[PDB]
Design a binder for these strands. Sequence first.
RNA 1: GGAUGCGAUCAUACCAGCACUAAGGCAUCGGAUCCCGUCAGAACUCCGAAGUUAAGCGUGCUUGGGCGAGAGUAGUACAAGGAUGGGUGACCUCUUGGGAAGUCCUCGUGUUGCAUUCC
Length: 175
Amino acid sequence: HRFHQYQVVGRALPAPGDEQPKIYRMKLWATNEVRAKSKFWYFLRKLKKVKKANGQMLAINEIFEKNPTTIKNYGIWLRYQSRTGYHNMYKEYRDTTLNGGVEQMYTEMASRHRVRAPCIQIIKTATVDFKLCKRDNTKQFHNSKIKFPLVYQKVRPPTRKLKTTYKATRPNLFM
RNA sequence: GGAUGCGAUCAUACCAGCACUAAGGCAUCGGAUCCCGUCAGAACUCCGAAGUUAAGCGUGCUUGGGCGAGAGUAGUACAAGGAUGGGUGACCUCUUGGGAAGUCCUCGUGUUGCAUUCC
Ligand SMILES: [Mg+2]
Ligand SMILES: [Mg+2]
Ligand SMILES: [Mg+2]
């Protein structure tokens, strides 16, 4: 998986003023742990008033998909920066893991809106029952009798050893 | 709980308006020979001790002004380093660091040395 979910826990440095400071937790999506802790300290500085130099890092744990063999419907609420302004949007995805949905979200924002990873803030992630899905192209795959042909086959050899520059006849492909 | 003399800090001590104070000390106060002094014994100077706490000085009060400390403003504004970062540009993102100031709100309104002295 490209993206991992982590639970990061930290607090302000214990000082004689408090000596038992409040504990803060976040669920962040990053490619490894070092990038997860940096993004945590980014949000703690901007949302609370605790930055890394005044704070303590307590724990960091990776969250995993409970059932990576079923298909879930995944809603994502995000904040992104465009060329002119800030906007929030809701996106829906179908995947066996929420990791795949987050990778799907980042890829889609890059294509449809030319938005890079730094300019995106995941507000909220959740699993949505198929009865409550909102976006089209997610409901149409809720058909229990779903049937269709494969309209693009990608004719190719299997293991690159069987590749030849020339062939004696044109390929026959059908669907 | 007070004062006086000489101070330290130099508004938490200043300013404005009100109220009150035992003893003592300060002070107001009486006078113009002498020293001194002016248009003027008002001031300054000299000599006193009839009266008074009215003023001054001291203490307290005010949803007071100011001053001082907090909280908040706000991880905002700004700004050190990095990017073959975005954008036509103006500018703006992210990354490794630093980080303010009015309004608004809360609280406070001194501390203290040496000598002598009053309860
Ligand atoms: Mg006279
Ligand atoms: Mg009086
Ligand atoms: Mg005041």
